[PDB]
Amino acid sequence: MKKVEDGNILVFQVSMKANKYQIKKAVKELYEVDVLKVNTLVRPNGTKKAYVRLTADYDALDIANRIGYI
Amino acid sequence: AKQSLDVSSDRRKARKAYFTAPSSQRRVLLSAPLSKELRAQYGIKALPIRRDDEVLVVRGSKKGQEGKISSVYRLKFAVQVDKVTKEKVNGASVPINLHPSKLVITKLHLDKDRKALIQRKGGKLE
Amino acid sequence: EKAGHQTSAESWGTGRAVARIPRVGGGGTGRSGQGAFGNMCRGGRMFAPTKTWRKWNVKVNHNEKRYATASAIAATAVASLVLARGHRVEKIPEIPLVVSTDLESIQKTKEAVAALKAVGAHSDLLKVLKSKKLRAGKGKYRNRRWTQRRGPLVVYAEDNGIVKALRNVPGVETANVASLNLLQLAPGAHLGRFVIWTEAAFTKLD
Amino acid sequence: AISKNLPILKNHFRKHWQERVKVHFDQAGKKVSRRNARATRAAKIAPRPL
Amino acid sequence: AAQKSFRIKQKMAKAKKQNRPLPQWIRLRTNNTIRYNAKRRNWRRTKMNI
Amino acid sequence: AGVKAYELRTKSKEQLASQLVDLKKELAELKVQKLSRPSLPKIKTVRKSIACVLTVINEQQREAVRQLYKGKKYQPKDLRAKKTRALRRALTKFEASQVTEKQRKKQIAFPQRKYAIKA
Amino acid sequence: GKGTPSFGKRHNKSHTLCNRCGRRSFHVQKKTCSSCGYPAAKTRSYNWGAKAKRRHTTGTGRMRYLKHVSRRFKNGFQTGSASKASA
RNA sequence: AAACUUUCAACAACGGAUCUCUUGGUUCUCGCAUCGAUGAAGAACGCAGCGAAAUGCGAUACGUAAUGUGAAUUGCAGAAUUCCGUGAAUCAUCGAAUCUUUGAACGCACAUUGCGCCCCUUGGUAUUCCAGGGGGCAUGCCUGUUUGAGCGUCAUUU
RNA sequence: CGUGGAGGUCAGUGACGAAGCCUAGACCGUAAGGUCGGGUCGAACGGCCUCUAGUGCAGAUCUUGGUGGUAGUAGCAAAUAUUCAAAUGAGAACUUUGAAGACUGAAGUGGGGAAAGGUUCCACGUCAACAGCAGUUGGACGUGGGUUAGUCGAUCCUAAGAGAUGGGGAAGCUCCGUUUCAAAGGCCUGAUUUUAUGCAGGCCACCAUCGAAAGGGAAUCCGGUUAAGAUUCCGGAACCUGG
RNA sequence: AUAUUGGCGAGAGACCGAUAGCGAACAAGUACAGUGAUGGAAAGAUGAAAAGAACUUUGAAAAGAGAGUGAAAAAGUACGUGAAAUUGUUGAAAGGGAAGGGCAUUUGAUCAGACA
Ligand SMILES: [Mg+2]
Ligand SMILES: [Mg+2]
Ligand SMILES: [Mg+2]
Ligand SMILES: [Mg+2]
Ligand SMILES: [Mg+2]
Ligand SMILES: [Mg+2]
Ligand SMILES: [Mg+2]
Ligand SMILES: [Mg+2]
Ligand SMILES: [Mg+2]
Ligand SMILES: [Mg+2]
Ligand SMILES: [Mg+2]
Ligand SMILES: [Mg+2]
Ligand SMILES: [Mg+2]
Ligand SMILES: [Mg+2]
Ligand SMILES: [Mg+2]
Ligand SMILES: [Mg+2]
Ligand SMILES: [Mg+2]
Ligand SMILES: [Mg+2]
Ligand SMILES: [Mg+2]
Ligand SMILES: [Mg+2]
Ligand SMILES: [Mg+2]
Ligand SMILES: [Mg+2]
Ligand SMILES: [Mg+2]
Ligand SMILES: [Mg+2]
Ligand SMILES: [Mg+2]
Ligand SMILES: [Mg+2]
Ligand SMILES: [Mg+2]
Ligand SMILES: [Mg+2]
Ligand SMILES: [Mg+2]
Ligand SMILES: [Mg+2]
Ligand SMILES: [Mg+2]
Ligand SMILES: [Mg+2]
Ligand SMILES: [Mg+2]
Ligand SMILES: [Mg+2]
Ligand SMILES: [Mg+2]
Ligand SMILES: [Mg+2]
Ligand SMILES: [Mg+2]
Ligand SMILES: [Mg+2]
Ligand SMILES: [Mg+2]
Ligand SMILES: [Mg+2]
Ligand SMILES: [Mg+2]
Ligand SMILES: [Mg+2]
Ligand SMILES: [Mg+2]
Ligand SMILES: [Mg+2]
Ligand SMILES: [Mg+2]
Ligand SMILES: [Mg+2]
Ligand SMILES: [Mg+2]
Ligand SMILES: [Mg+2]
Ligand SMILES: [Mg+2]
Ligand SMILES: [Mg+2]
Ligand SMILES: [Mg+2]
Ligand SMILES: [Mg+2]
Ligand SMILES: [Mg+2]
Ligand SMILES: [Mg+2]
Ligand SMILES: [Mg+2]
Ligand SMILES: [Mg+2]
Ligand SMILES: [Mg+2]
Ligand SMILES: [Mg+2]
Ligand SMILES: [Mg+2]
Ligand SMILES: [Mg+2]
Ligand SMILES: [Mg+2]
Ligand SMILES: [Mg+2]
Ligand SMILES: [Mg+2]
Ligand SMILES: [Mg+2]
Ligand SMILES: [Mg+2]
Ligand SMILES: [Mg+2]
Ligand SMILES: [Mg+2]
Ligand SMILES: [Mg+2]
Ligand SMILES: [Mg+2]
Ligand SMILES: [Mg+2]
Ligand SMILES: [Mg+2]
Ligand SMILES: [Mg+2]
Ligand SMILES: [Mg+2]
Ligand SMILES: [Mg+2]
Ligand SMILES: [Mg+2]
Ligand SMILES: [Mg+2]
Ligand SMILES: [Mg+2]
Ligand SMILES: [Mg+2]
Ligand SMILES: [Mg+2]
Ligand SMILES: [Mg+2]
Ligand SMILES: [Mg+2]
Ligand SMILES: [Mg+2]
Ligand SMILES: [Mg+2]
Ligand SMILES: [Mg+2]
Ligand SMILES: [Mg+2]
Ligand SMILES: [Mg+2]
Ligand SMILES: [Mg+2]
Ligand SMILES: [Mg+2]
Ligand SMILES: [Mg+2]
Ligand SMILES: [Mg+2]
Ligand SMILES: [Mg+2]
Ligand SMILES: [Mg+2]
Ligand SMILES: [Mg+2]
Ligand SMILES: [Mg+2]
Ligand SMILES: [Mg+2]
Ligand SMILES: [Mg+2]
Ligand SMILES: [Mg+2]
Ligand SMILES: [Zn+2]
- Enumerate the nucleotides of strand H whose atoms come under 7 Å of any protein CB: 21-24, 27-31, 34-46, 48-53, 56-61, 63-87, 89-92, 94-99, 102-105, 110-113, 131-133
Evaluate whether C200 touches C105 at the Cβ level (below 8 Å): no
DSSP string covering B13-60, please?
A: HHHHHHHH--HHHHHHHSEEEBPHHHHHHHT-SEEE--SS-EEE--SS
Cis status, amide bond into F111, omega within 30 of 0: no
Check A69 against F29: CB less than 8 A apart: no
* Residues in CB range of F65: below 8 A, 6 or more apart: F76, F79
DSSP string covering G13-58, please?
A: -SEE--TTT-SS-EETTTTEESSS-TTSSSPP-BTTBHHHHHTTST
Report how far residue B92's alpha carbon sits from residue A30's, in angstroms, rounded to the nearest whole number.
51
Touching chains, G (3+ CB pairs < 8 A): E, F
Evaluate whether B106 touches B39 at the Cβ level (below 8 Å): no
Q: Which residues in chain G are contacts of E49 at CB distance < 8 A? A: 24
Nearest protein residue to the C1' atom of I211, measured from CA: G29
- Enumerate the nucleotides of strand J whose atoms come under 7 Å of any protein CB: 2-5, 7-13, 15-17, 19-24, 26-27, 29-42, 49-54, 68-69, 77
Pairing of strands B31-33, B46-48: antiparallel
Q: Does A44 touch chain E (CB under 8 A)?
A: yes
Pairing of strands B78-87, B66-73: antiparallel
Q: Which residues in chain E are contacts of G24 at CB distance < 8 A? A: 49-50
Report how far residue B83's alpha carbon sits from residue B54's, in angstroms, rounded to the nearest whole number.
11
Pairing of strands B105-107, B54-56: antiparallel
Check F36 against A69: CB less than 8 A apart: yes
- Comparing CB atoms, the residue among B1, B9, B11 nearest residue C141 is B11
- Enumerate the nucleotides of strand I whose atoms come under 7 Å of any protein CB: 4-14, 44-46, 49-50, 54, 60-65, 113-120, 139-143, 146-150, 153, 162-163, 173-174, 213, 232-234
G21 appears as a binding residue in the annotation? yes
Beta bridge partners of C197: C98, C155
Report how far residue C106's alpha carbon sits from residue C92's, in angstroms, rounded to the nearest whole number.
21
Long-range pairs of C98-103 with CB within 8 A, sequence gap ≥ 24: C98/C196, C98/C197, C98/C198, C98/C199, C98/C202, C99/C154, C99/C196, C99/C197, C99/C198, C99/C199, C100/C198, C100/C199, C101/C157, C101/C198, C101/C199, C101/C200, C101/C201, C103/C154, C103/C156, C103/C162, C103/C198
Q: Does A68 touch chain E (CB under 8 A)?
A: no
Decide: helix, strand or coil at residue C87.
coil
Q: Distance from residue C34 (CA) to nucleotide J83 (C1'), in Å?
A: 27
Residues from G contacting F (CB-CB < 8 Å) are: 69, 77, 79
Pairing of strands C195-198, C153-156: parallel
CA separation, residue D50 to residues C38, D33, D35, F117, F118 (Å) = 58, 16, 13, 11, 14
Q: Distance from residue G56 (CA) to nucleotide I160 (C1'), in Å?
A: 39
CA separation, residue G45 to residues C88, G31, G52 (Å) = 70, 18, 8
Touching, A vs F (3+ Cβ pairs under 8 A) = yes
Which nucleotide comes closest to C38 if you measure CA to C1'?
I63
Residue E40's nearest CA partner among E20, E25, E26 is E20
Nearest protein residue to the C1' atom of H82, measured from CA: F1
DSSP string covering F59-78, please?
A: HHHHHHHHHHSTTSS---TT
Considering only the C-alpha atoms of chain B, give the largest distance between any 2 of them, rounded to a whole number of Å. Answer: 56
Report how far residue A35's alpha carbon sits from residue A27's, in angstroms, rounded to the nearest whole number.
8
CA of A36 from ligand 79 middle (Å) equals: 14
CA separation, residue G5 to residues C138, E47, F23, G1, G10 (Å) = 62, 21, 65, 6, 10
Residues 16-75 of chain C with CB under 8 A from chain D are: 52-53
Evaluate whether B79 touches B73 at the Cβ level (below 8 Å): yes
CA of C137 from ligand 9 middle (Å) equals: 6
Give the method of determination.
Answer: X-ray
CA of E12 from ligand 98 middle (Å) equals: 20
Report how far residue F82's alpha carbon sits from residue A27's, in angstroms, rounded to the nearest whole number.
42
Q: Distance from residue C92 (CA) to nucleotide I194 (C1'), in Å?
A: 121
Q: Does D49 touch chain F (CB under 8 A)?
A: yes
Residue C196's nearest CA partner among C117, C142, C126 is C117
Q: Distance from residue F97 (CA) to nucleotide H48 (C1'), in Å?
A: 55
Q: What is the resolution of this structure in A?
A: 3.5
Around ion ligand 18, which residues have CB less than 5 A away?
G 39
Q: Please give the radius of gyration of chain C, using alpha carbons only, rounded to the nearest integer.
A: 28
Q: Distance from residue F1 (CA) to nucleotide H82 (C1'), in Å?
A: 10
Report how far residue G18's alpha carbon sits from residue G24's, in angstroms, rounded to the nearest whole number.
6
Check F33 against A68: CB less than 8 A apart: yes
Identify how many contiguous H helices and E strands chain B contains and give both numbers: 4, 7
Evaluate whether B21 touches B29 at the Cβ level (below 8 Å): yes
Pairing of strands C146-147, B93-98: unpaired
SS3 of chain A: CHHHHHHCECCEEECCCCCHHHHHHHHHHHHCCCECCCCEEECCCCCEEECCEECCCCCHHHHHHHHCCC
Sheet holding G15-16, edge to edge: G15-16, G26-27, G32-33
Query: Burial level of C150, CB count in 10 A (0-12/13-18/19+)?
Result: buried
Q: Does F114 touch chain D (CB under 8 A)?
A: yes
Q: Give the count of Cβ contacts less than 8 A between chain B and C.
A: 7
Residue E50's nearest CA partner among E16, E21, E11 is E11
Touching, C vs E (3+ Cβ pairs under 8 A) = no
Residue B33's nearest CA partner among B52, B47, B43 is B47
Evaluate whether A64 touches A4 at the Cβ level (below 8 Å): yes
Decide: helix, strand or coil at residue B81.
strand
Report how far residue B11's alpha carbon sits from residue C141's, in angstroms, rounded to the nearest whole number.
7
* Residues in CB range of C66: below 8 A, 6 or more apart: none
G74 appears as a binding residue in the annotation? no
